[PDB]
Amino acid sequence: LGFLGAAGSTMGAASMTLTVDTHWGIKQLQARVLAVEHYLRDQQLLGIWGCSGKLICTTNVPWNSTWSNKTLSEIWDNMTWLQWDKEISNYTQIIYGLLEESQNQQEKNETDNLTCD
Amino acid sequence: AAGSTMGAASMTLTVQARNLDTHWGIKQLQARVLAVEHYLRDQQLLGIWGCSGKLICTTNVPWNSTWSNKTLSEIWDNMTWLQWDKEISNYTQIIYGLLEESQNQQEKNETDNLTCD
Amino acid sequence: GFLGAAGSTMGAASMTLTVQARNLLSGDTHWGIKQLQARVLAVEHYLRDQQLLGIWGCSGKLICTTNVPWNSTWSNKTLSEIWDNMTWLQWDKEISNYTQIIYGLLEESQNQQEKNETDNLTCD
Amino acid sequence: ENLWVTVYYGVPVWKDAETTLFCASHNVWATHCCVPTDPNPQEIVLENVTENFNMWKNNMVEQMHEDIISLWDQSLKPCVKLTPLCVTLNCTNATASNSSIIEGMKNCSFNITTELRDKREKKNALFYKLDIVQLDGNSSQYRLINCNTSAITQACPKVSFEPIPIHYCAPAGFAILKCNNKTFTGTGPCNNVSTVQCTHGIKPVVSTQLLLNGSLAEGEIIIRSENITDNGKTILVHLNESVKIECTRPNNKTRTSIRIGPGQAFYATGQVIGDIREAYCNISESTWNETLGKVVKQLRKHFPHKNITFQPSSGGDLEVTTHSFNCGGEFFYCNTSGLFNSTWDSITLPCRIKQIINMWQEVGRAMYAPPIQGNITCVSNITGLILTRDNTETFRPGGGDMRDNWRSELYKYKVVKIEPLGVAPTACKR
Amino acid sequence: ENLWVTVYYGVPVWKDAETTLFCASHNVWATHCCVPTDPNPQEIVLENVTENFNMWKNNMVEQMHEDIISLWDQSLKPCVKLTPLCVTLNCTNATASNSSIIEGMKNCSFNITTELRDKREKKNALFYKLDIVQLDGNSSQYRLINCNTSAITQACPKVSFEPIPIHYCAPAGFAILKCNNKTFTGTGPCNNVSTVQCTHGIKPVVSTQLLLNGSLAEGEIIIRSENITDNGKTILVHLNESVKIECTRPNNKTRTSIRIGPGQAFYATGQVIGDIREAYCNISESTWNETLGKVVKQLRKHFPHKNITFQPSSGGDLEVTTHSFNCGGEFFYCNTSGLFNSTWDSITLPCRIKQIINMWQEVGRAMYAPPIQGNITCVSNITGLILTRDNTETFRPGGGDMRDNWRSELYKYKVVKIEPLGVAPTACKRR
Amino acid sequence: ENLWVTVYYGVPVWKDAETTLFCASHNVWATHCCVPTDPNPQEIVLENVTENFNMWKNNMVEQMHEDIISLWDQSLKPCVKLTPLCVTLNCTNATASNSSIIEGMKNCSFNITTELRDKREKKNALFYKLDIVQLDGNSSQYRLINCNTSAITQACPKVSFEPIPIHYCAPAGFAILKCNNKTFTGTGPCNNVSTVQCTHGIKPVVSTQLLLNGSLAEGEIIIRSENITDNGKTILVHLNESVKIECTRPNNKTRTSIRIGPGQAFYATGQVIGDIREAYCNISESTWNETLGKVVKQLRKHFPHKNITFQPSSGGDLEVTTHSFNCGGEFFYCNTSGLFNSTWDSITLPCRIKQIINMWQEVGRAMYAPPIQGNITCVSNITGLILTRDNTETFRPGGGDMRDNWRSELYKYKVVKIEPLGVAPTACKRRVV
Amino acid sequence: XXXXXXXXXXXXXXXXXXXXXCXXXXXXXXXXXXXXWXXXXXXXXXXXXXXXXXXXXXXXXXXXXXXXXXXXXXXXXXXXXXXXXXXXXXXXXXXXCXXXXXXXXXXXXXXWXXXXXXXXXX
Amino acid sequence: XXXXXXXXXXXXXXXXXXXXXCXXXXXXXXXXXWXXXXXXXXXXXXXXXXXXXXXXXXXXXXXXXXXXXXXXXXXXXXXXXXXXXXCXXXXXXXXXFXXXXXXXX
Ligand SMILES: *[C@@H]1O[C@H](CO)[C@@H](O[C@@H]2O[C@H](CO)[C@@H](O[C@@H]3O[C@H](CO)[C@@H](O)[C@H](O)[C@@H]3O)[C@H](O)[C@H]2NC(C)=O)[C@H](O)[C@H]1NC(C)=O
Ligand SMILES: *[C@@H]1O[C@H](CO)[C@@H](O)[C@H](O)[C@H]1NC(C)=O
Ligand SMILES: *[C@@H]1O[C@H](CO)[C@@H](O)[C@H](O)[C@H]1NC(C)=O
Ligand SMILES: *[C@@H]1O[C@H](CO)[C@@H](O)[C@H](O)[C@H]1NC(C)=O
Numbered sequence A: 001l002g003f004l005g006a007a008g009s010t011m012g013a014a015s016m017t018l019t020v021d022t023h024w025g026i027k028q029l030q031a032r033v034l035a036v037e038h039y040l041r042d043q044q045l046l047g048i049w050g051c052s053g054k055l056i057c058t059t060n061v062p063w064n065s066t067w068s069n070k071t072l073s074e075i076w077d078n079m080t081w082l083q084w085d086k087e088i089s090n091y092t093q094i095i096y097g098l099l100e101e102s103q104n105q106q107e108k109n110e111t112d113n114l115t116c117d
Numbered sequence B: 001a002a003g004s005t006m007g008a009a010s011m012t013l014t015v016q017a018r019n020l021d022t023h024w025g026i027k028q029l030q031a032r033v034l035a036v037e038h039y040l041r042d043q044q045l046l047g048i049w050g051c052s053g054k055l056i057c058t059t060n061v062p063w064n065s066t067w068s069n070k071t072l073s074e075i076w077d078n079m080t081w082l083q084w085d086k087e088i089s090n091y092t093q094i095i096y097g098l099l100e101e102s103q104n105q106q107e108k109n110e111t112d113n114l115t116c117d
Numbered sequence C: 001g002f003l004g005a006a007g008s009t010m011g012a013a014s015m016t017l018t019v020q021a022r023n024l025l026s027g028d029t030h031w032g033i034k035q036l037q038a039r040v041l042a043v044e045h046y047l048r049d050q051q052l053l054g055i056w057g058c059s060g061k062l063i064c065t066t067n068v069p070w071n072s073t074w075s076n077k078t079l080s081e082i083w084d085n086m087t088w089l090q091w092d093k094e095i096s097n098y099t100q101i102i103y104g105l106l107e108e109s110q111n112q113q114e115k116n117e118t119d120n121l122t123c124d
Numbered sequence D: 001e002n003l004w005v006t007v008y009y010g011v012p013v014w015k016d017a018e019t020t021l022f023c024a025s026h027n028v029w030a031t032h033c034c035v036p037t038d039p040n041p042q043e044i045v046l047e048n049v050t051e052n053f054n055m056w057k058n059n060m061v062e063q064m065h066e067d068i069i070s071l072w073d074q075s076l077k078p079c080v081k082l083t084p085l086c087v088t089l090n091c092t093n094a095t096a097s098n099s100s101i102i103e104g105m106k107n108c109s110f111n112i113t114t115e116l117r118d119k120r121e122k123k124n125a126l127f128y129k130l131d132i133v134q135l136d137g138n139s140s141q142y143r144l145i146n147c148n149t150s151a152i153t154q155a156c157p158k159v160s161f162e163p164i165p166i167h168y169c170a171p172a173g174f175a176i177l178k179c180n181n182k183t184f185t186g187t188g189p190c191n192n193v194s195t196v197q198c199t200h201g202i203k204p205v206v207s208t209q210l211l212l213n214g215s216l217a218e219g220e221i222i223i224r225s226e227n228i229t230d231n232g233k234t235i236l237v238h239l240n241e242s243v244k245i246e247c248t249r250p251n252n253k254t255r256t257s258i259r260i261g262p263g264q265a266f267y268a269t270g271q272v273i274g275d276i277r278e279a280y281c282n283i284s285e286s287t288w289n290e291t292l293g294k295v296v297k298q299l300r301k302h303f304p305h306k307n308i309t310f311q312p313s314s315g316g317d318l319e320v321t322t323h324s325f326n327c328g329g330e331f332f333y334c335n336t337s338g339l340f341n342s343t344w345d346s347i348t349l350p351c352r353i354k355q356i357i358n359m360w361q362e363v364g365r366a367m368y369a370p371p372i373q374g375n376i377t378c379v380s381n382i383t384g385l386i387l388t389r390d391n392t393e394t395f396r397p398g399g400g401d402m403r404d405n406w407r408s409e410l411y412k413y414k415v416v417k418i419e420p421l422g423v424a425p426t427a428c429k430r
Numbered sequence E: 001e002n003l004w005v006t007v008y009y010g011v012p013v014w015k016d017a018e019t020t021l022f023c024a025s026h027n028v029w030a031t032h033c034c035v036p037t038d039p040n041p042q043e044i045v046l047e048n049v050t051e052n053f054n055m056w057k058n059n060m061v062e063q064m065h066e067d068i069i070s071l072w073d074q075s076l077k078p079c080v081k082l083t084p085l086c087v088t089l090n091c092t093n094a095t096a097s098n099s100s101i102i103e104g105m106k107n108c109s110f111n112i113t114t115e116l117r118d119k120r121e122k123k124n125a126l127f128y129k130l131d132i133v134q135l136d137g138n139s140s141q142y143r144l145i146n147c148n149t150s151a152i153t154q155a156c157p158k159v160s161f162e163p164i165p166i167h168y169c170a171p172a173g174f175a176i177l178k179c180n181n182k183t184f185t186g187t188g189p190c191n192n193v194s195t196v197q198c199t200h201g202i203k204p205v206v207s208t209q210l211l212l213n214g215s216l217a218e219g220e221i222i223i224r225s226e227n228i229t230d231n232g233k234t235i236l237v238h239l240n241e242s243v244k245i246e247c248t249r250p251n252n253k254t255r256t257s258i259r260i261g262p263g264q265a266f267y268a269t270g271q272v273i274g275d276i277r278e279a280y281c282n283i284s285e286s287t288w289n290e291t292l293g294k295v296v297k298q299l300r301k302h303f304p305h306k307n308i309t310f311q312p313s314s315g316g317d318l319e320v321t322t323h324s325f326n327c328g329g330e331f332f333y334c335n336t337s338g339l340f341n342s343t344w345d346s347i348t349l350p351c352r353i354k355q356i357i358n359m360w361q362e363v364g365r366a367m368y369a370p371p372i373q374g375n376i377t378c379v380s381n382i383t384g385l386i387l388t389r390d391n392t393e394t395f396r397p398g399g400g401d402m403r404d405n406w407r408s409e410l411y412k413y414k415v416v417k418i419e420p421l422g423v424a425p426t427a428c429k430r431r
Numbered sequence F: 001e002n003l004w005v006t007v008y009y010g011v012p013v014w015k016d017a018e019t020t021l022f023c024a025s026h027n028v029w030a031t032h033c034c035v036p037t038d039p040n041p042q043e044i045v046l047e048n049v050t051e052n053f054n055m056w057k058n059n060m061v062e063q064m065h066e067d068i069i070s071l072w073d074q075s076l077k078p079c080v081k082l083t084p085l086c087v088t089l090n091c092t093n094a095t096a097s098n099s100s101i102i103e104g105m106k107n108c109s110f111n112i113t114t115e116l117r118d119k120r121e122k123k124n125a126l127f128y129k130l131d132i133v134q135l136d137g138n139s140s141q142y143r144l145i146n147c148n149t150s151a152i153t154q155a156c157p158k159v160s161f162e163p164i165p166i167h168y169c170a171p172a173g174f175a176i177l178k179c180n181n182k183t184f185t186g187t188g189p190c191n192n193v194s195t196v197q198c199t200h201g202i203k204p205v206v207s208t209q210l211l212l213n214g215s216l217a218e219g220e221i222i223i224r225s226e227n228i229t230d231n232g233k234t235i236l237v238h239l240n241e242s243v244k245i246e247c248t249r250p251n252n253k254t255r256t257s258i259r260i261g262p263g264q265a266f267y268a269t270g271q272v273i274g275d276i277r278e279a280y281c282n283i284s285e286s287t288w289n290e291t292l293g294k295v296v297k298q299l300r301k302h303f304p305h306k307n308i309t310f311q312p313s314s315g316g317d318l319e320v321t322t323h324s325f326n327c328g329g330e331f332f333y334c335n336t337s338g339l340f341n342s343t344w345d346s347i348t349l350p351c352r353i354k355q356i357i358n359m360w361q362e363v364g365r366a367m368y369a370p371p372i373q374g375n376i377t378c379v380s381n382i383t384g385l386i387l388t389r390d391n392t393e394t395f396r397p398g399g400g401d402m403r404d405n406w407r408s409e410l411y412k413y414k415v416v417k418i419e420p421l422g423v424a425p426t427a428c429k430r431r432v433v
Numbered sequence G: 001x002x003x004x005x006x007x008x009x010x011x012x013x014x015x016x017x018x019x020x021x022c023x024x025x026x027x028x029x030x031x032x033x034x035x036x037w038x039x040x041x042x043x044x045x046x047x048x049x050x051x052x053x054x055x056x057x058x059x060x061x062x063x064x065x066x067x068x069x070x071x072x073x074x075x076x077x078x079x080x081x082x083x084x085x086x087x088x089x090x091x092x093x094x095x096x097c098x099x100x101x102x103x104x105x106x107x108x109x110x111x112w113x114x115x116x117x118x119x120x121x122x
Numbered sequence H: 001x002x003x004x005x006x007x008x009x010x011x012x013x014x015x016x017x018x019x020x021x022c023x024x025x026x027x028x029x030x031x032x033x034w035x036x037x038x039x040x041x042x043x044x045x046x047x048x049x050x051x052x053x054x055x056x057x058x059x060x061x062x063x064x065x066x067x068x069x070x071x072x073x074x075x076x077x078x079x080x081x082x083x084x085x086x087c088x089x090x091x092x093x094x095x096x097f098x099x100x101x102x103x104x105x
């Protein structure tokens, strides 16, 4: 337990704790504004992917073995999140683009004229 | 890509675009703060209405025949969003008031002590 | 009509929640700093209330039901008294020493709800 | 029993709070308070509410005070400094009048570097005695007053300080509550409260002893104090009727210009033509006596003893014992002893004028006021008296360091923070 | 009969707007326009967008102007204040290179205070006749010109003002639209609109009548004005071919240094080494004349006759009657009357050099340019002309202000605010 | 087919990052670091976590340096300028107290403008020789040594610069990782890494050669350097035991107030009464001898089978050849040649006093220290030495810029950005009603 | 390592129910794999009698015991059960749990359990 | 789904190469496991999918499956290898098993 308490744990166990002077004046404003921007960036991505309010969010995007070809049993019970982040860092934007596309298609189907009303 | 027609499904790309010497420092902070204000303004308006965490939302407010007087096929296939917004259905303050009232009535009905539906 | 319902009963005032909320965001060097500080704080206050509502499960809501019961010690009143005779300004004081307790209970309840939902997903 | 805690957002409640208000409306006030006001301001009456107002602890008074001083000080930066004038002066008796008998002025000559370096000239100007200090005994060697503790800045010639009304407006998340009780009288509950976003227009008038242009009481004469029964406190008497006051300098000045440097010149009185009185104020006698009688009738409800008296301001320096008027560009210091002398067609207040003006009660930051060419008359409305108190009661004109004047307009307003969240029991469980 | 309101967030629309753009990348431009950029063309063609542009009402021109002035004023703050020099100068005719009659130069002596105030020294420096004003008649006594009205600040010798390209970039929520019409005249609808995040890289080159450096028209020579008919408007001519111009001060100069006070020092001309002909600015006779004729052929589209003529500039001060060049650390003021003289091998223009200048059209805060030691040569490309219209029709090489220089490159860009929220009807009612 | 992308939020990962830290808790340090200190920081050990640290590339050090310079200069803005004192000074021998010569000081007279700008007065002041430069050969005419290059600002007599403990704290979204390995040298991997929000309190001490009032090593003496075999690098020796040192100036300097002009005044040394000796400083002899021997024992592990010896600094001005420190507002320059002289009850180190101080490497700025009356004594501990290098291996008490004084405290901290959002495969597809 | 173990097997009377169960605290808590049961009678190979997408509750019982093998799991307890009802008199088999580990391919049936056996009989 | 015990009997002499054949009724991956165990005791995977040789097992004792054809290969028969070979129709829900090959050694 604790902030980053699970940093050395395997991903599986770690997933169970996700619930955890004008010169000076300009520096303070920059710090406050930046903190707000970071907050909004994460919430906006969760919203656009359909994960608003969820610590765990499943999606309709399949896992592509090209990003990683490992078995779940050698990921979740074996490697830490720091290692995982490095392993698939190169596909981060690909995944995000796919998640956005899937969510937008889901919404278009939701309000299509056929079989709605 | 504002050309095409209104039947666009590229909406996520126009959303992720938002939110990314003391004279200079003030100007840059003003630019950042304003970008945040506008983002939040739109989110709050959507949040007051029933559309929260969605890019596309339907409501309980009927469409008025005097706002456009066009069919759905004309609107979605023969026009784009720039023309739509600039020429017709360009009295949006009417709609916004209707949307806020309808939503508050709905939310209030959901907790009526006699019918906790 | 911002605060127009301030003297109205608690029940009646529930119909002006949108009005009161929609006016929370808006509507040389030293001067510029004072104004940036004022705008930044207005944003932070807005966001802190939104974060707290999210903590309690009120994502996008003006009125939220819960799993936390009301304690008769906080206020021993019935619904016909508190919603119909009192205005918000008249009882807010009564809960001034229980507010942190209530907020803590709402947070704990939300955490337990999420855990059950997290452990038991819906698939396929 | 049911009863679950229901969360509400957008609840119309508030708490006392202190924030930064913004100012909304060449001229200095217009330049700074560049923000426009609402052409059709709204006001919301809050029915069935009670609010406690406390003017003596109202942070808006302090905030406006600090912003006014800041504006003033900033406004004097981009113009002429007079340090080069702090040299020994000759100061002969002024000969401006026909018989050389003004006796309130000296003709001072001095050796000053002109705008071109390594070239000095003998220059001269007329100065008021109140701005001149003798360097030693029995010696015609003089100096400007503010040369040993600080330095004098010349007022910027293109900037008007005319007290055009301004409005203070709350930022989002805040609101200003206003008291609508005509007989409020001071700290305590107000039973008729309305909400505004901006205050009414307030004129940043800088008088002392007597308040000039401002609003009048809507009721009877209102006497306000922190504690009227204690001495050592300011008593603000707010009249429901104005008293007309006419002040003038019935003579013609001509200005001379002494070059100081590239971009700079010192302006000074060259010559004065006319009669001897420098200045005076015209107060109708019957109006004044009737006005005090009305004040006393109300004063007696707090002070039942008869034979209440008024006295001519105790004593102190010429910032305290006299009136103070920023009339055009001239600063008048009028003797009010002709008004405050009583036991319970017009009254002349003789007036003196100064050019080196101390700003508020700051140390240094002296300002020099260039002479105003020609003749000047100002007419203004007296709206109230600032009295202090010390058998019978004795009242004297007095006052605090400006905040007390500003308290007379901001007394009816309070700033509150809006607090949209709260909880309440309901019959519906999640 | 069954349509419902649907709210759409992320709608690809915009409205015209005025916002703050940021400027992206010992040089001042390189210190202020600090944001790094990669190529990132991002030229997204919108395909069917036909938007309205107006170069004469474009707020970016004004914004660029305010930022440039601000940068210059900021750049000159941590520099030497030349106030102790507003003293009487005892001047004679300058002598150098065995000649005591150098036109344009005076040898001035003066008494200036040293770091220790109780001591003073007599110094000597050479000055230009355009920097120095006589105090009285029949006298050797002179003063610096701007000591009459304001402070003079010496530009720091270590600071570079080279007009390296800079880019103006939109803040999030805003976009810059580009007009890609090769014959666009500066106003009205423009087809083939594309969207970018930043401008192409604009060089903040300053001039008074010939437009130097920057891009050429990709079409034919384009005549642009707010109103061609109206004689009260500036006409800009954007050439499709450049004219090569070379300027120089081939003579050598030395510099001296005066300790005006603690830390600070004044730089001044020491000696002139060489002949005394200045600037020698020229363009080929084979390029001018023909270029001017091509401009006339285009003028004839609006002025369809053979009574078109070019005359020398009119009156006013040096800053508006001649051609200012920012050649290295020195300011050239060139006589172009030899170019604008026609009715419808190289040509040399004599020029004068000035050191104390009032920038743009501002008053006071004069800047002093320290001398360049050694000789200087500048080569630049004339890309356009600033012309006015003062029966027959006469054009003059002048008029306008300092903003017209940037309108010439910013005319193709517009800033819009993205407004991604709108409403449209659907067949679906909320469930 | 059967694996789906799942989004996880609150994932315990981070990236190396550079951000702006804020400083948490009359004087300057106390008014600038106005933010309250966390009364009970929660240090969290990250079990089975290792991380890479590098004290020589640590931006926390660089940021602290910039904050200090800024505070120093901001603090001195609303103060008296001494530019009017650049006037030629007429100086004699100075004979304070008895009929003798006060070495190290001169009695200088000068013509200074009175409040009136026309007339002048003649005033006297005593100055240290180190602040005064002779204008020509055999002359009696002198000037203040820094009027040639800049303005000299008198420090405000009401403003203390005495170091107070301060804490650097990360902003939301950031955290500081801390190395808790007792023998870690400052670079490379560290096991037993913990997370904190704020650093321990440190003091912005500005001494050179000998570090004063810092923390002590948890383990044995640690020799920290970048590429230790490189003679171009500075060696920081971090002691595990402190050495007590006391410096004293046993006399009373009177204070003369010389008005400059319109609310402006200069504080001059008036007269000096007391024991006229060179501000001597006492360091325990046996403590030092043992301490230095222990350093060599460890230094020999990097330079084995060599005779390690010590010498006084080889060069530079009296800002680096000496031990400079500022304890009571009195700036001391002590001779350490009595310590760094070896062939591996107290040692008196003579000291000089300067009144015009060119701090750091600002060059274009200078501060004048008002005289301090009374008899001043300062007590401090030496907590680390700074050495430079180059069958004898010679070390000298040389040093770098002032960043090195803070590298020695911040060597164990790193700033990282928290990145809570990430994805991984699982075997549960979104239900989609 | 994984340590799945079987429990509560019984010699149930024919047509009786028995709460056969297993647990595997060492293995991932549903974050990975899936529940699977298999059984074998004497002189028999194996059959995939039941399974569940333990991450949630998507059941996939085999037709052979569609009316009885009501497999269920508690992700929270890292445990699973197959409390079959109406045991056939012929339903005598060892039963074991397995981890349906997979990599964008059919599962490997890894980490087989202790296989406690039942003995339903008339 | 279904699969045949194509090698219901599959004895081999020690040190002989061998494979226990499987014939599926349809194309599928063909994960397999060895019943190297007592009755009412755990089985262990030989390979997953078509050719994912099991961890902690000889890789030599493996072959890839294709279409509906598969076999549990062995580099050489040994007494240690004397375990039945169970073939799963590893594509099907509740995958069907072929009766395991005797695979005696
Ligand atoms: C109380 O209110 C009255 C009424 O507004 C103020 O009188 C006004 O005072 C200003 C400044 O002295 C006068 O402005 C000047 O007018 C002359 C006209 O020729 C012009 O040449 C000057 O450049 C300048 O604009 C204004 O006319 C005068 N208004 C009236 C009706 O007389 C009075 O000053 C206020 N008193 C105080 C203490 O604020
Ligand atoms: C105040 O009370 C009266 C009844 O006495 C009621 O009619 C009125 O609506 C109330 N005002 C508000 C703001 O609700
Ligand atoms: C003016 O200067 C003269 C110089 O001789 C001096 O005698 C005289 O007293 C001064 N002042 C007056 C008032 O004359
Ligand atoms: C205030 O003074 C103005 C001067 O023009 C006059 O018109 C107005 O009536 C006066 N107000 C009062 C209350 O006397």
Ligand SMILES: *[C@@H]1O[C@H](CO)[C@@H](O)[C@H](O)[C@H]1NC(C)=O
Binding pocket: D280, D281, D282, D283, D346, D347, D348, D349
């Ligand atoms: C008032 O002004 C008039 C001139 O208009 C003058 O005669 C009279 O003496 C003045 N009276 C007072 C009391 O100032």
Ligand SMILES: *[C@@H]1O[C@H](CO)[C@@H](O)[C@H](O)[C@H]1NC(C)=O
Binding pocket: D249, D250, D375, D376, D377
């Ligand atoms: C100034 O003098 C003129 C003389 O004609 C007179 O008309 C005007 O009213 C006077 N003004 C003042 C302020 O006394």
Ligand SMILES: *[C@@H]1O[C@H](CO)[C@@H](O)[C@H](O)[C@H]1NC(C)=O
Binding pocket: E246, E247, E248, E279, E280, E281, E282, E345, E346, E347, E348
């Ligand atoms: C053109 O300019 C160059 C550089 O000043 C000079 O050498 C050349 O002689 C000039 N041409 C003519 C015709 O003078």
Ligand SMILES: *[C@@H]1O[C@H](CO)[C@@H](O)[C@H](O)[C@H]1NC(C)=O
Binding pocket: F091, F092, F093, F101
């Ligand atoms: C001080 O006295 C010594 C005596 O030896 C002499 O050498 C030195 O030059 C004197 N210095 C001054 C400033 O008189």
Ligand SMILES: *[C@@H]1O[C@H](CO)[C@@H](O)[C@H](O)[C@H]1NC(C)=O
Binding pocket: F093, F094, F095, F096, F097, F107, F124, F126, F271, F272
């Ligand atoms: C410095 O010189 C002055 C000259 O008047 C003398 O009074 C003073 O005592 C001297 N002080 C010292 C320390 O020599």
Ligand SMILES: *[C@@H]1O[C@H](CO)[C@@H](O)[C@H](O)[C@H]1NC(C)=O
Binding pocket: F213, F242, F379, F380, F381
């Ligand atoms: C060094 O002395 C300082 C000041 O007295 C004190 O903070 C520190 O504890 C001392 N260290 C030791 C252990 O003497």
